[PDB]
Assembly symmetry: C6
Homo-oligomer: 90 residues x 6
Amino acid sequence: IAVGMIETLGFPAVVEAADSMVKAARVTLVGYEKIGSGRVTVIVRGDVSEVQASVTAGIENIRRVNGGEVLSNHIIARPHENLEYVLPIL
Amino acid sequence: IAVGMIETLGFPAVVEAADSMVKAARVTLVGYEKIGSGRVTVIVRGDVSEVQASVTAGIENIRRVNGGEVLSNHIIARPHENLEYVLP
Amino acid sequence: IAVGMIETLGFPAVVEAADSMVKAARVTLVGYEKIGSGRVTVIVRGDVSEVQASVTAGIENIRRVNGGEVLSNHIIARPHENLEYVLPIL
Amino acid sequence: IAVGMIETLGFPAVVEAADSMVKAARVTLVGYEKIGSGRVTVIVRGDVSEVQASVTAGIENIRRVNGGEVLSNHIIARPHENLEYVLP
Amino acid sequence: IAVGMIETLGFPAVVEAADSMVKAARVTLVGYEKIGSGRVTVIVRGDVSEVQASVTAGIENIRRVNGGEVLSNHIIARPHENLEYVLP
Amino acid sequence: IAVGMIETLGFPAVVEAADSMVKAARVTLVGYEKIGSGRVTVIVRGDVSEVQASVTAGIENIRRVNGGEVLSNHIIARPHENLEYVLPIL
């Protein structure tokens, strides 16, 4: 099951990404990650095509947020088992 | 009901944000979030029109803080059941 | 009861602010807040006129500190009850 | 056996780094380290040639992340017994 | 008695700060504070003239650290009873 | 017993420093310190001459690291007892 994530400069933007993502498709919102410098990441899990739907919707909708910026985004279709317990993507 | 947040550079302005929001309308201050880089967020819940009125008041009144700066603001009208896994 | 706060770039400066504040008037020094980027805030509680006396003395006296800067400052005379338990101003 | 790490600006790229490493060769993802300033590191163990293969794959594939950036990469061939006091 | 602090960019210089302060005069190292952004502070207690002598020694000797930088220094002569709510 | 330390911009570099240090001489590697802005410090303890051997090797070998930088470094030959329990150098 695929993992999708959107990284924002700012917190209100990550919440809108999160919201848009879980409304747009069949994905489980599996938390968010803070790494400093105002960089925050929301992460979801589901079918690869649902996760694409989610990420696209998430990026689009930070245009709605006043002062929002997407810094990065990515999808992995077939994430290796080892990552589940090292990284906070579960 | 909706959720309303204002992010600021600097803590004193975020306290004004919070104070003005909760005084302006029928919303509950439910959240304070720090993400580093001096970026702080204040989060409220209540009817979408009460949330609209509070965020507006918060952004205006931060102009009254010496050294205050708003970085971002946002409202979400019908927040998803499971959005609580990113709120504090 | 009113809340006053002074935000500094730097730690030695926030301690001088804190000291000046609590000497200048009848206020309780109710801790300090760190938010990253070297931004730190001291907070006090008391009568509105005491808090004013305190913040004025606090800002003045970071001139004494070598390398000190005030980044922001603010006072709220009648802070809403809700903020007491969400924000670290108690 | 060796240790292999790739540091990135931004978390999504560091997940790709990890994924690509572990898929490329016979290495075990053993570590994820944050030092602030948006700087994140991913750490693997295994034979030096497997490690070499993994790190190389990780650096290439981060080019495929929208907003991805590699900050630093390194391999240590015969890491000291007591290096575990800085690994996570 | 007074309180003496030296803030530095970088941890190694703050260790020198500390070492020099405590060796220079009759003061006790009571505090080490991190506020992010690489900013670190070292805090001492003792007579105002011992504190004056220590801070001075600390500022001089950081010049001897490769990559050392002082960001700010300060002394408070008669620190308030309740200043301990901001000291570590 | 002397204390030596190397500060890096970046984590992979601090590990190479740490490794080189403990291979080059009789020193105990006594952890590392993070202070923000991507600034990390490795710390060791041993004879003054061993610590010098270690720091020299440490600084040299971050040339091996792709993207590595040393920001600062220092040695104290006879560190004051008071520092042991205030600072994380033990």
